[PDB]
Structure 1
Amino acid sequence: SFVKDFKPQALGDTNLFKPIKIGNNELLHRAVIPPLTRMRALHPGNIPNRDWAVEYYTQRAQRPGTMIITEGAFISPQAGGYDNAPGVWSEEQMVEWTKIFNAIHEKKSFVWVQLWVLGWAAFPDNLARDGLRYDSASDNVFMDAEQEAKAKKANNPQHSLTKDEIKQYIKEYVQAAKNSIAAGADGVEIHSANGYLLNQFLDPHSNTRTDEYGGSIENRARFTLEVVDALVEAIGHEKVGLRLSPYGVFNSMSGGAETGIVAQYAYVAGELEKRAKAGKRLAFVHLVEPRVTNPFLTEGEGEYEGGSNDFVYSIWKGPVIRAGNFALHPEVVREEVKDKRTLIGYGRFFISNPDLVDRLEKGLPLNKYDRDTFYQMSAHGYIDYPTYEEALKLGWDKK
């Protein structure tokens, strides 16, 4: 059924429907599909779903000129820890990704692979089973007691990365990005947000290191910028984006409670602009808004009102993708896209509306999403959400 109390507003008369170039891609509108983990990848081997993934991405690429960022993809087994998320390290995986990229391109849309490393958000028992470390920035602070428990139970205690193991990750990032481009992706997005490994280095709560990767703003940012630099070198700045969530508390990050948090993220932004003036401007910076500090809370919950992402705009002068509770708030989007370098990521509603761009353009009702099938091993709640046309035929307007 449709979202019951929603008062849609057509956005076709706004900059949301003005074309923009991001990296090498000529977007025809600025509604972006942000990275959305769906847990349909098959085990063993973290293989993109051979039955459903192509169709899923095809449906969502249906509006020509759409920028799609994939679900997080592990760069290596050690970077993983969820059996049903995809990876981009093996030939098996890339064969399925190539089919996906081809289908999106045939719909005249674009695809960026999000490169994902879990750190302490990984399941230590899964890792222990596969002979892998349970990794984070530090070893004296844990995500929650449960995760700290599972580690000890699985005899896989949280391990503070040595400098050589960090380098190994950087090498894996490099190879995963090369794999992505070679298989046909338009670019990659470095996931440095939402409390995953890179974020665990950025945040002073999770990073209590005293070597050059912790103890200061510059140090905590080091790992992230090294990945950025390694990837810009490997496949070019025009094929690299960065995702950040300055106010996020997901996976036990500090958010606005940390008084130094804006300074931490402002520094990263500064360093990106620095590289941009020196000839190497990233394709985009992708920001999670304080509008959503946890995307598994219903829209309007977990909103942080004490901080704004606007600071990034004073520092980084390139494209900015903003994501978080925008689908139900076209009145907000209308204002934000008045800025000419701002794009809008729509997450949960792109899950449930394959034709979302049309619906935004024309102010059509939205399909409700089903949180129960966000992470299910099923076609249901994945590829069976109807377009508006199909929804009408199913009588959804009269439910």
Structure 2
Amino acid sequence: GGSNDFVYSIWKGPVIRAGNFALHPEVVREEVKDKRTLIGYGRFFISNPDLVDRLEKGLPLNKYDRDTFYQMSAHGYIDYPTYEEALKLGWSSFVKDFKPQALGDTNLFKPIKIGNNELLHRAVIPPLTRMRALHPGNIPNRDWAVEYYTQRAQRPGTMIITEGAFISPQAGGYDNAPGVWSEEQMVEWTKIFNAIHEKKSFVWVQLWVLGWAAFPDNLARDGLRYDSASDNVFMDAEQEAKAKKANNPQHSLTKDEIKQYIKEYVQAAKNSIAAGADGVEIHSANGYLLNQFLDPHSNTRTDEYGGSIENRARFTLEVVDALVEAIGHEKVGLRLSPYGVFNSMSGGAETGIVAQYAYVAGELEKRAKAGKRLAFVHLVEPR
């Protein structure tokens, strides 16, 4: 009882759908009929570095392991084999009861242009947190990350959206998540961007700000604030306990701090493109700071950044405008999850959510008509 099709009735640019598309090619085949729709594959791009070639010819794919997702290891990260490599290792099988289809005839493999990049296929690599960044310093993995991103840039002209990169330590909270603010991170990021560029593929950076999803103890350790939209609403009992235990209560953002966050967004974007990135994506989904401001359950502010649909979307659009005026509208994308209830979001329960995100896409399209259209709009499917 939910759909993201309304965005198509409002936003007239490229739309990147993501979620539960790997094991359902009969759905993708219907969804690619729309000429401006791209498909992202999450888990099976971790499980298969050559997933694109397996989607073109209808090859069987490999099983993904749930335990190797957020674990620090080379295992289940860069050890996944190609099709031929999976054949040379014998079998005693791959996936279970599954019927693959060849989408090489569909619209998935006809070229399209997003931003300054010329995609030869419409298979997108969504942002994926692997939790393998070096701590401390939030440095991307020097031993594995380069190889990891290089393996999935196998198909020429493959759009890659990197994992959530903290625009600032203040936007941090995860010790195993890579950053973008410091030069030490920018060296490794430059190496990765080059490694992807040499394979004739493209790389996009997801700008990440945890919000209330951050770990209060990790922030109190570095003398940072545990902040959100409102200070009277919390995630859960654990996040509530960790805040008072570590003597770091949930902080309500003021104007100055918001402007600071925006400045950090701009600096993060310019630093990203200085390292050789194709563009940046604003993560306003999955119950993080921007999404926290968007969602009425998390946003109870009475000031300029809350109280209404126009006010709750002011932050996201502020970041959008800032980045557009910074690096250009062709290097800026947006990530949204209307029906996502992750990190204590409303989702389908709130009857006004569709109106909120319709307002978002509306403002976006209005800016698009003005001559400044974003490269794409990333959507997370209901599940």
TM-score normalised by L of structure 2: 0.76
State how many pairs are aligned.
291
Aligned twin of 2:152: 60
Q: For 1:61 and 1:197, how far apart are their aligned partners in 2?
A: 30
Cα deviation, 1:103-138, whole Å, max 9, x if unaligned, reads 101010000000000000000000000000001000
Match of 1:111 among 194, 203, 210: 203
Q: Which amino acid aligns with 2:309?
A: I
Q: For 1:43 and 1:132, how far apart are their aligned partners in 2?
A: 17
Aligned twin of 1:394: none
SS of the residue aligned with 1:264?
helix
1:178 aligns with 2:274: no
Match of 2:282 among 182, 190, 198: 190
Q: Which amino acid aligns with 2:245?
A: K
Aligned twin of 2:294: 202
1:227 aligns with 2:319: yes
Structure 1 residue 6: deviation in Å? 1.2
Q: Which 5+ residue runs of structure 1 have no aligned equivalent?
A: 291-302, 304-399
1:99 aligns with 2:191: yes
Match of 1:7 among 93, 96, 99: 99
Matched ranges for 1:106-145 at <5 A: 106-145=198-237
Q: Which amino acid aligns with 2:228?
A: S
Identity %: 100
SS of the residue aligned with 1:287?
strand
1:81 aligns with 2:173: yes
Aligned twin of 1:169: 261
SS of the residue aligned with 2:339?
coil
Aligned twin of 2:239: 147
Q: For 1:241 and 1:38, how far apart are their aligned partners in 2?
A: 22
Cα deviation, 1:24-68, whole Å, max 9, x if unaligned, reads 000000010000010010011100001111000000001000000
Q: Which amino acid aligns with 2:283?
A: H
Q: For 2:233 and 2:306, how far apart are their aligned partners in 1?
A: 14
TM-score normalised by L of structure 1: 0.73
1:252 aligns with 2:360: no
Q: Which 5+ residue runs of structure 2 have no aligned equivalent?
A: 1-92
Q: For 1:3 and 1:69, how far apart are their aligned partners in 2?
A: 26
Q: For 1:2 and 1:160, how far apart are their aligned partners in 2?
A: 49
Cα deviation, 1:249-307, whole Å, max 9, x if unaligned, reads 000000010000000000000000000000000000000011xxxxxxxxxxxx2xxxx
Matched ranges for 1:1-399 at <5 A: 1-290=93-382, 303=383
Q: For 1:134 and 1:223, how far apart are their aligned partners in 2?
A: 18
Structure 1 residue 3: deviation in Å? 1.2
Q: Which has the higher contact order (CA 8 A, sep 6+)?
A: 1
SS of the residue aligned with 2:171?
coil
Please tell me the root mean square deviation across aligned C-alpha atoms, in Å.
Answer: 0.5
SS of the residue aligned with 1:285?
strand
Structure 1 residue 221: deviation in Å? 0.1
Aligned twin of 2:77: none
Structure 1 residue 145: deviation in Å? 1.1
4+ long deviations beyond 3 Å: none
Structure 1 residue 219: deviation in Å? 0.2
Cα deviation, 1:72-98, whole Å, max 9, x if unaligned, reads 000000000100000000000000000
Structure 1 residue 166: deviation in Å? 0.4
SS of the residue aligned with 2:335?
strand
Q: For 2:256 and 2:122, how far apart are their aligned partners in 1?
A: 40
Q: For 2:376 and 2:116, how far apart are their aligned partners in 1?
A: 11
